[PDB]
Design a binder for these strands. Structure first.
Ligand SMILES: O=c1ccn([C@@H]2O[C@H](COP(=O)(O)NP(=O)(O)OP(=O)(O)O)[C@@H](O)[C@H]2O)c(=O)[nH]1
Ligand SMILES: [Mg+2]
Ligand SMILES: [Mg+2]
Ligand code: NA
Length: 325
DNA sequence: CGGCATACG
DNA sequence: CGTA
DNA sequence: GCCG
């Protein structure tokens, strides 16, 4: 079991679901308290369990697994012994966890904003609504549409959205392409949003594309909210006899950078963080969604594929459905 | 102990 | 600050 | 919280 998540296949469904979900509760809680280091360790330990070929049944099976020290092991131990971990349950019940979770789930609200509101005594969504003076227009959108946005996006939702995005993209720039990314590209059956990557086979033609796409989407009455090369929108998605609000992210990249952007936006989030960490610390190369940079030779690696990028980094290729760290 | 991904809106 |  |  290698120490970086990008070094091992991590399937979407696995054999330690309960254990990983408990550790991810502690990761989340760590983030609510600003402790990014602890969040990372708990996320990594959870991911290690996702990568195992069978259930963890005894404590000794944790020996020699990366990212399992005294704390994470004790969490697993209690779950194995009693089916629950007191620390985890304590977090679950806490007013702090529940309110920070509720608040950060709002589009436009991050840990810093949630925390401030919490300290001001705010607890509920109606607490925010009954004082819209303090809200940004983004937060007002997030709050108005919160119920719909809390509803899982389904695969059938995605196909319908892709068609309408392709339609607008097609008028905006003939020959431009739309690629499904994010969680659904990794095989997820549900999602919190739909993520699309847009490019054109002729380098440079993609310049200026996103405002033209956005203009045409808005013209068809499909945009409930939007604010460039990235756009975080709320779409009006038809439903039987009605509609619902759905979060949709659009990203444009030149075709030269397409593999890097495909890699970066397909995730998982932890997978990308680990991959970038691996790149910098183990290979001395700087990776982002634009490219891979050798800071010694002052050169960018050209990639024609995600496979190229894994090869560059000396990693075995992992298809998207094995990047579910 | 230092480090913990990386960028755009 | 928010977002991915 | 854990690695190196
Ligand atoms: O902090 C972040 C967030 C997101 N991302 C990258 O953006 C992708 C989409 O970001 P996302 O927030 O849409 N997450 P996703 O994996 O689609 O799952 P879901 O919650 O169902 O939407 C992720 O899969 C990562 O590649 C990051 O690199 N960093
Ligand atoms: Mg997504
Ligand atoms: Mg997204
Ligand atoms: Na939020």
């Amino acid at each position: 079991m290698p120490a970086y998540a990008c070094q091992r296949p991590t399937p979407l469904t696995h054999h330690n679901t309960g254990l990983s979900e408990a550790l991810e509760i502690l990761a989340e809680a760590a983030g609510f308290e600003g402790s990014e280091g602890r969040l990372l360790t708990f996320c990594r330990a959870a991911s290690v369990l996702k990568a195992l070929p069978s259930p963890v049944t005894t404590l000794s099976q944790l020996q020699g697994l990366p990212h399992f020290g005294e704390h994470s092991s004790r969490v697993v131990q209690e779950l194995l012994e009693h089916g629950v971990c007191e620390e985890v349950e304590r977090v679950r019940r806490s007013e702090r966890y529940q309110t920070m979770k509720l608040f950060t789930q709002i589009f436009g609200v991050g840990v810093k904003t949630a925390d401030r509101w919490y300290r001001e005594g705010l607890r509920t969504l109606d607490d925010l609504r009954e004082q819209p003076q303090k809200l940004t227009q983004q937060q007002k959108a997030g709050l108005q549409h919160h119920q719909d946005l809390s509803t899982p996006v389904l695969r059938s939702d995605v196909d319908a959205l892709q068609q309408v995005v392709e339609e607008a993209v097609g008028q905006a720039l003939p020959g431009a392409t739309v690629t499904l990314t994010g969680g659904f590209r990794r095989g997820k059956l549900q999602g919190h949003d739909v993520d699309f990557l847009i490019t054109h086979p002729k380098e440079g033609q993609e310049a200026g594309l996103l405002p033209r796409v956005m203009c045409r989407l808005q013209d068809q009455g499909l945009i409930l909210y939007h604010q460039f090369e990235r756009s975080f929108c709320i779409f009006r998605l038809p439903q039987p006899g009605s509609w619902k609000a759905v979060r949709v992210d659009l990203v444009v990249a030149p075709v030269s950078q397409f593999p890097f952007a495909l890699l970066g936006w397909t995730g998982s989030k932890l997978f990308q963080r680990e991959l970038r960490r691996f790149s910098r610390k183990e290979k001395g190369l700087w990776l982002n969604s634009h490219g891979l940079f050798d800071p010694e030779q002052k050169t960018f690696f050209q990639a024609a594929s995600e496979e190229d990028i894994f090869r560059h980094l000396g990693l075995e290729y992992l298809p998207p459905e094995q990047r579910n760290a």
